Amino acid sequence: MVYQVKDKADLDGQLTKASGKLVVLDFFATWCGPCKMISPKLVELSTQFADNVVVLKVDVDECEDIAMEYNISSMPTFVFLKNGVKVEEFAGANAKRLEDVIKANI
């Protein structure tokens, strides 16, 4: 349910297919402790809101150009989009905050 983009083009297509659903972009790194710590929760929410949410993971070491483009500097950073418009964005592994956002903007 949680898809990890191959590159910008891949991201620019996943967002298209997404249509009018809440999109959650998880910018993370494999060396980031808090990122792993929240990955399970993201998965849970992912399936708990399948049909009305689409979670895309973006590895910063693999897609550095997408990291610069979105101006990320802290991991994990969650950018929430809906119909092509940033609905919100925050960094850190605050699991409750994460569920709050998905739920409130689903």
Active site residue 63: no
Active site residue 35: yes
| Resolution expressed in Å | 2.3
CA atoms of 53 and 81, how far apart (whole Å): 10
| Method used to obtain the model | X-ray
Full set of structural domains in the chain with CATH: 1-106 (3.40.30.10)
Q: Which residue among 23, 24, 25, 35 is the active-site one? A: 35
Q: Which residue among 2, 18, 32, 91 is the active-site one? A: 32
Within 13 A of 51's CA, how many CA atoms are on the CB side? Answer: 2
Burial class (CB in 10 A: 0-12, 13-18, 19+), 95: middle
